[PDB]
Amino acid sequence: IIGGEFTTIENQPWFAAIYRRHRRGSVTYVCGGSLISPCWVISATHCFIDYPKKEDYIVYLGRSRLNSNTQGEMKFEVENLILHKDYSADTLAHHNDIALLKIRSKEGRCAQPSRTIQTIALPSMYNDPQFGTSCEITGFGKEQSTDYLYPEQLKMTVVKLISHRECQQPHYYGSEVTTKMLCAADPQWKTDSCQGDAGGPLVCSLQGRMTLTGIVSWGLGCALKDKPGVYTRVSHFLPWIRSHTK
């Protein structure tokens, strides 16, 4: 997250932190995700497509810090890693960038709701907020595009939704953006998602309900003029989600 503010997991208690194991004691951060039911985390296919084996990943819930443990966190292996079979990528835009992780602890359990572990509601189909609406994003990604390190403490920011008509202009993203994607950005381009934020939640309040409107997907750079963050549009994937979480 460029700009924005530090947070703890209480303020985004569906946020999942996803890590990869290595041949070497290297266990390293991969991407964010969102808890949509006790046994399911939703995230972006691009986070996993190079290494698509479920045993390579660990998922934490209840965690506010990147490389240190948070009191009350839970640790899960990945029982099933489900990628969207229509996934595609070019240099930039990822299509159908949506993934599900079925989570299971060493003891064979799913997430147990607490003050730090909660689910987020899915949108109703084709039901997104109007352009201009302020929503929130959350993640451990870079704070500056030139940084090498990721922040140790979770961050959040606010971005406003951009219409497909605005985002498809040539001086924004042209044909790279489809109606299965949502653009979002700050009026001054001063705050944004960045590398290491993929897979995390774009949350909007829709009729009183905190809603998973989007999943962090791609962008050109971070916090660049006329180059919004791009998000998988969750409300266009409900049948995919309904089927695969069985």
Strand arrangement within the widest β-sheet reads 10-11-12-15-14-13
What is the name of the CATH class of the largest domain? Mainly Beta
Give the helices and strands as they follow along the chain: EEEEEEEEEEEHEEEEH
Tally of distinct domains: 2
Overall 3D geometry?
globular
CATH overall fold name of the largest domain:
Thrombin, subunit H
Query: Roughly what percent helix?
Result: under 10%
Known CATH architecture of the largest domain = Beta Barrel
According to CATH, the homologous superfamily of the largest domain is Trypsin-like serine proteases
How many strand segments?
Answer: 15
As a whole number of angstroms, the C-alpha radius of gyration is 16 Å
Taking the sheet with the most strands, its summary is: 6 strands, antiparallel, barrel
Helix/strand/pairing class, anyone? mainly beta
Tally of DSSP helical segments: 2
For the terminal residues, how far apart are their CA atoms? Answer: 33 Å
- Beta content comes to 35-45%
PDB class: blood clotting
Keywords: antagonist, PAI-1, uPA, blood clotting
Assembly: monomeric
Entry title: Structure of PAItrap, an uPA mutant
In short:
It is built from 2 helices and 15 strands. With 246 residues, the protein is mainly beta. Residues 1-246 form the Peptidase S1 domain.
Structure description:
Helices cover 4% and strands 36% of the residues. The protein has 2 domains: 1-12 and 120-235, Trypsin-like serine proteases (Thrombin, subunit H, Beta Barrel); 13-119 and 236-246, Thrombin, subunit H (Beta Barrel). The protein starts with a strand and ends with a helix. It is globular. With 246 residues, the protein is mainly beta.
